[PDB]
Amino acid sequence: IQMTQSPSTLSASVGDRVTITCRASQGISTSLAWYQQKPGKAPKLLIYKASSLESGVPSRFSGSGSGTEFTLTITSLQPEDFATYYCQQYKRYWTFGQGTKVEIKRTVAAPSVFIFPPSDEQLKSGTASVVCLLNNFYPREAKVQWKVDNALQSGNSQESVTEQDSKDSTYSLSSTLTLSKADYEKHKVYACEVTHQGLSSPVTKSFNRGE
Amino acid sequence: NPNANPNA
Amino acid sequence: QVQLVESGGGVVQPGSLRLSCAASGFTFSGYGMHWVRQVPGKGLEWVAIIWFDGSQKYYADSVQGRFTISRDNKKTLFLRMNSLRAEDTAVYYCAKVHDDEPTQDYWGQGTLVTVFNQIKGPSVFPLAPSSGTAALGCLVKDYFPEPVTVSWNSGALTSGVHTFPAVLQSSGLYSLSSVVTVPSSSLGTQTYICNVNHKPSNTKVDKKVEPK
Amino acid sequence: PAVTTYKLVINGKTLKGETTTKAVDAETAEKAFKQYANDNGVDGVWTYDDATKTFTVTEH
């Protein structure tokens, strides 16, 4: 028995009506619970038996569904409701969904893009890490595409994204392209190309190996 | 059965 | 007044540990309890459950014959962790079972369990700078286990700092980057040093990031 | 095999600070520290303080 939530992430404003769905493999009747968890804190039980409200939970939370499909509804979203929500079955053992992160909506903001060549100190040991910075953008969905002499790269990069900022509700993203030194020395033009809703056309930052 | 009520 | 205070977490070797869970605000003897773990950055995974009785013990397929669940109705829940494997690094939550349906309602604060295989300090490389604002940073690569902390100029530079979540590389070692944006006009007269700490290796190093 | 803690002071051109390692003896810890300094791109003169069990690598 495994649970699939939709969507995995969503942006909303205070006072909105938000809806989270959960699909179970195999029927579980009403043996479903919804949990809330904020980063670094323990999860809290919102709904049990698909629709019963746990004591102390605000009236704006409500659950629906039976069988395999289930819906968590939050009326008039409050600032303390920005969090991650999990559905869970307790028919056979205890299985959680992947979680739905409710984030704060704001206006679209394009990223500032910077590229960093590998350092001579790192190249001294046979590896080249090229880094592309995407700074203070919204929404979270930003595409980084590495190009090496105009050849598209895949499978040799890694990304991480900050949490939404305290003040301006933007994200930043760091992407590392990792090549062997030998492979790095075989090519000239290193570029990261950035696609984002805040950009009318993609932005490319590049450099030529050798200042 | 693991999911029987483990309470009083 | 339902309270669940957890303790006993820490660092071990691929070893033994015993987590505690002090219950209050409810008749502990009448309810069953749970242990649920959460890998940082991942979802929730159940570990064990025992009745109010202590008669029926049930474990997950991954901790069978290693962790053992017990209780001293001292009103405390225990999980003696033995033969710790790498994949058991997670925050461990104890949880109480609801009245009507057999699932968790109240959860403990959760204490961290970290299982160090081999300790590796970090390699610190500069991200050297080159509209009126420049970006620079440090790449903290090839350390294990988590975490590392990064400050800038021993904490005197905090605004415009982004320290990114670490990623786990194919090598099994972690990598993270910390960046900051500063006035490009200051790049010649102000020094920028990133201070990197890795307590598992007792590493405290300062990397000066020099402009291009 | 009992191991003790050794310390490395790093006096690099741009990388300065300290790290530690656990080894069975002093020469084995120097091999780990040399690898650590190499991984950071720091090559330099190696010295050892027997009393404090502290190695120092001094870049050019």
Q: Which residue has the tokens 């003169």?
A: D45
- Measured CA to CA in angstroms, residue C109 lies from A211, C135, C183 at distances of 51, 38, 42
Domains of chain D are 4-59 (3.10.20.10)
How many angstroms separate the CA atoms of A91 and A30, rounded? 9
Residues C142 and C175 in one domain: yes
How many angstroms separate the CA atoms of A197 and A108, rounded? 7
Neighbours of C, requiring at least 3 CB pairs below 8 Å, are A, B, D
- Smallest Cβ–Cβ distance between C206 and the set D17, D36, D41 belongs to D17
Backbone angles phi, psi at A45, to 5 degrees: -80, 125
CB contact under 8 A, C204 and D18: yes
Overall number of domains in chain C: 2
How many angstroms separate the CA atoms of A154 and A180, rounded? 15
Measured on CA atoms in the order C180, C181, C182, C184, is the torsion positive or negative?
Answer: positive
CATH code of residue C128: 2.60.40.10
The angle at the Cα of A118, spanning A117 to A120, to the nearest 5 degrees, equals 120
The resolution, in Å, is 2.1
Distance of CA A15 to the CA centre of its chain: 23
How many angstroms separate the CA atoms of A20 and A205, rounded? 38
How many angstroms separate the CA atoms of A90 and C32, rounded? 14
Expressed as residue numbers, the domain containing C138 is 123-209
Residues C72 and C56 in one domain: yes
Domains of chain A are 2-104 (2.60.40.10), 112-208 (2.60.40.10)
The angle at the Cα of A162, spanning A156 to A165, to the nearest 5 degrees, equals 155
Contacts of A91 in chain B (CB under 8 A): 3
The angle at the Cα of A176, spanning A170 to A179, to the nearest 5 degrees, equals 170
How many angstroms separate the CA atoms of C33 and C98, rounded? 10
CB contact under 8 A, B2 and A90: no
The angle at the Cα of B7, spanning B1 to C2, to the nearest 5 degrees, equals 135
Name the helix (H) or strand (E) containing D30: helix D26-39
Q: Is A41 on the interface with D (CB under 8 A)?
A: no
**Region at C83 (left for phi over 0; alpha for psi -120 to 50; beta for the rest):** left
Contacts of C139 in chain A (CB under 8 A): 119, 122, 129, 131, 176
Per-residue HEC secondary structure of C110-121 comes to CEEEEECCCCEC
At C77, list the tokens.
Answer: 């829940």
Contacts of A124 in chain D (CB under 8 A): 38, 41
Q: Compute chain D's Rg from CA coordinates.
A: 11
Nearest CA in chain B to C98: B7
CB A132, CB A192: distance < 8 Å? yes
How many angstroms separate the CA atoms of A85 and A95, rounded? 14
Backbone angles phi, psi at D26, to 5 degrees: -80, -40
One DSSP character per residue, chain A reads --EEEE-SEEEE-TT--EEEEEEESS--TT-EEEEEE-TTS--EEEEETTTEEPTT--TTEEEEEETTEEEEEESS--GGG-SEEEEEE-SSS-EE---EEEEE----BPPEEEEEPPPHHHHTTTEEEEEEEEEEEBSS--EEEEEETTEEP-SSEEEEEPPPPTTT--EEEEEEEEEEHHHHHT--EEEEEEE-TT-SS-EEEEEES--
CB contact under 8 A, A43 and C93: yes
Q: Is A24 exposed, middle or buried (0-12, 13-18, 19+ CB in 10 A)?
A: buried
| Experimental technique used to determine this entry | X-ray
**Which neighbouring-strand residues pair with C196?**
C150, C205
At A26, list the tokens.
Answer: 């195999």
How many angstroms separate the CA atoms of A25 and A41, rounded? 28
**Region at A76 (left for phi over 0; alpha for psi -120 to 50; beta for the rest):** left
Q: Is A122 on the interface with D (CB under 8 A)?
A: yes
How many angstroms separate the CA atoms of C45 and C90, rounded? 10
- Measured CA to CA in angstroms, residue C212 lies from A89, A126, A155, A210, C209 at distances of 56, 21, 30, 12, 10
Amino acid sitting at position C191:
T
Residues C105 and C9 in one domain: yes
Residues C138 and C101 in one domain: no
Half-sphere CA count of C112, side-chain side, radius 13 A: 11
CB A147, CB A193: distance < 8 Å? yes
Residues C110 and C10 in one domain: yes
How many angstroms separate the CA atoms of A205 and C183, rounded? 20
How many angstroms separate the CA atoms of A176 and A199, rounded? 22
CB contact under 8 A, C99 and B3: no
Boundary residue ending a domain (C67, C87, C115) = C115
Q: Breaks in chain C at C–N > 2.5 Å: after which residues?
A: 14, 73, 130
**Which neighbouring-strand residues pair with C162?**
C179
Name the helix (H) or strand (E) containing D35: helix D26-39
How many angstroms separate the CA atoms of A63 and A43, rounded? 17
Terminal CA-CA length for chain B: 16
Q: Is C203 on the interface with D (CB under 8 A)?
A: yes
Dihedral, CA of residue A55, residue A57, residue A59 and residue A61, to nearest 10 = -120
How many angstroms separate the CA atoms of C126 and C109, rounded? 38
At C120, list the tokens.
Answer: 């590796």
| Residue pairs spanning C and D at CB distance below 8 A | 41
For residue A155, how many other CB atoms are within 10 A of its CB? Answer: 4
Of A18, A17, A31, A146, the residue nearest A87 (C-alpha): A31
CB contact under 8 A, B6 and C51: yes
Amino acid sitting at position C83:
S
Of C108, C113, C45, the residue nearest C77 (C-alpha): C108
For residue D1, how many other CB atoms are within 10 A of its CB? Answer: 3
Of A61, A53, A64, the residue nearest A85 (C-alpha): A61
CB A106, CB A167: distance < 8 Å? no
